[PDB]
Design an enzyme around this catalytic site. Structure first.
Site, PDB file in Angstrom:
ATOM      1  N   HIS B  94       0.744  -1.115  -0.093  1.00 14.69           N
ATOM      2  CA  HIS B  94      -0.066  -0.002  -0.074  1.00 14.69           C
ATOM      3  C   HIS B  94       0.823   1.451  -0.026  1.00 14.69           C
ATOM      4  CE1 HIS B  94      -2.857   3.022   1.009  1.00 14.69           C
ATOM      5  NE2 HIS B  94      -3.850   2.240   0.409  1.00 14.69           N
ATOM      6  N   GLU B  96       0.925   4.047   1.577  1.00 18.84           N
ATOM      7  CA  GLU B  96       1.371   4.431   3.188  1.00 18.84           C
ATOM      8  C   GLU B  96       2.356   3.445   3.472  1.00 18.84           C
ATOM      9  OE1 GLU B  96      -2.655   4.515   4.501  1.00 18.84           O
ATOM     10  OE2 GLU B  96      -3.139   5.850   2.756  1.00 18.84           O
ATOM     11  N   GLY B 170      -6.789  10.137  -0.775  1.00 22.65           N
ATOM     12  CA  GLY B 170      -7.307  11.136   0.502  1.00 22.65           C
ATOM     13  C   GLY B 170      -7.591  12.498   0.254  1.00 22.65           C
ATOM     14  N   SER B 210      -9.461   8.205  -4.194  1.00 19.75           N
ATOM     15  CA  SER B 210     -10.507   9.093  -4.153  1.00 19.75           C
ATOM     16  C   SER B 210     -11.748   8.605  -4.812  1.00 19.75           C
ATOM     17  CB  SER B 210     -10.279  10.442  -4.484  1.00 19.75           C
ATOM     18  OG  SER B 210      -9.230  10.854  -3.726  1.00 19.75           O
TER      19      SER B 210
END
Lengths: 247, 247
Positions: B94, B96, B170, B210
């Site tokens: 991912h 992140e 995000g 998004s």
């Protein structure tokens, strides 16, 4: 006044529901001195299970957490969550976090601050690498690391310091009572000059690094060693003997 | 033949037992097309709960895991444990993980090899940073990342590819059908030449970034877009509409 003896067992990445269920069951029935403050660090995925089954008088710690209650941080858990399943401790700055997963002094600091602010206890881990001890800069290093932690601690009431020579984790080799004392004595002398006398006197500094039932009596005997962070041995029955190092 | 529409919901570091229990109870009741394969990525500390509560027909994924069954890796969990609580998926690589937690292409590749060997399914994530897309090298970067994944996949039957432009996570901004298609078309094309036509024709490549109930119909309409990895919308009621993007 006297610092309560404190033994945490860090299971690391080990166990399943059945193996950990048996570990916990033995521990719940074990003869332990009430003198000792025991905390078990469970894999995140079993934290809720561990807290359910362990006796309420034994604490539960997350092996890591992040520095905000929520957010776009896939893979991470927060103190809010740790609280939500009834545990009251987190281990931060463990050697494996720092050195396997590149967690910085600055980050561990942010994490400590948030964990305390959210009302967890923190076992904050420090320690030098073998090359660092070779060159003679153990003191310099653990002072550095402790300072990153201390900058982020307003209240030491719920903090325990775990000193863990990185080169002693999982290898056959522990420090020996005298070597350990020399560094615990130093860390307390640091909390003396940089924070306060009362904090140095009341704050538990615990040793980890190849602690066994066979070597703990002697380590615990040292004046400035207040207990242990226990790796491998926390999975075994001898964890009980280490809880009872002083008796 | 036809690649089944796959929508995974990555809750990230969000929720507690009460909030997640409510989200789950809604999703279990919601009118969802059988058509769609749904998987929810829960925080590690709630994987067991999530699997218990979620209807069997909806999958559960860990948001991350490590690359060996057990060992001295404080803070990590393994496919073995994910299995042990009845989950069958893991999200690996991912955005992140790579860019907040520094996880390398080579490590992700190790994790994928291990998760698949242990019989989990993998949602393997790839994605370019804003600065990399500026230099015109989206193609080069997602290829690089996919090769690190495909070097470590012997069997694609249980892999899903998630393409997730990092800058689009995000923020208020998703790619638009055309910009997404360009990339998915290209990634399939890479699988075509680097692996096989049957892997290229059967493997799901899903878009993240998004995705909302308001834009998903158009995105899913694109020919080489096979579903979604859904961030913030997965916590919301509109996750249902995204699962239903095709009907």
């Amino acid at each position: 006044a006297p610092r309560k003896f404190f033994v945490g067992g860090n299971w690391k990445m080990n166990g399943d529901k059945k193996s950990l269920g048996e570990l916990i069951h033995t521990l719940n029935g074990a003869k332990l001195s009430a003198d000792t403050e025991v905390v078990c660090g469970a894999p995140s995925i079993y934290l809720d299970f561990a807290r359910q089954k362990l006796d309420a008088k034994i604490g539960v710690a997350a092996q890591n957490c992040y520095k905000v209650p929520k957010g776009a941080f896939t893979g991470e858990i927060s103190p809010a969550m740790i609280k939500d399943i009834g545990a009251a401790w987190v281990i931060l700055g463990h050697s494996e976090r720092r050195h396997v997963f590149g967690e910085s002094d600055e980050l561990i600091g942010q994490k400590v601050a948030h964990a305390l602010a959210e009302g967890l206890g923190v076992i904050a881990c420090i320690g030098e690498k073998l090359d660092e001890r070779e060159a003679g800069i153990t003191e310099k290093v653990v002072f550095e690391q402790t300072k990153a932690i201390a900058d982020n601690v307003k209240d030491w009431s719920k903090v325990v310091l775990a000193y863990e020579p990185v080169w002693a984790i999982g290898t056959g080799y522990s420090l020996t009572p005298q070597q350990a004392q020399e560094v615990h004595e130093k860390l307390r002398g640091w909390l003396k000059s940089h924070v306060s006398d009362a904090v140095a006197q009341s704050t538990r500094i615990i040793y980890g690094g190849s602690v066994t039932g066979g070597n703990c009596k002697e380590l615990a005997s040292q004046h400035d060693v207040d207990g242990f962070l226990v790796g491998g041995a926390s999975l075994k029955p001898e964890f009980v003997d280490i809880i009872n190092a002083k008796h």
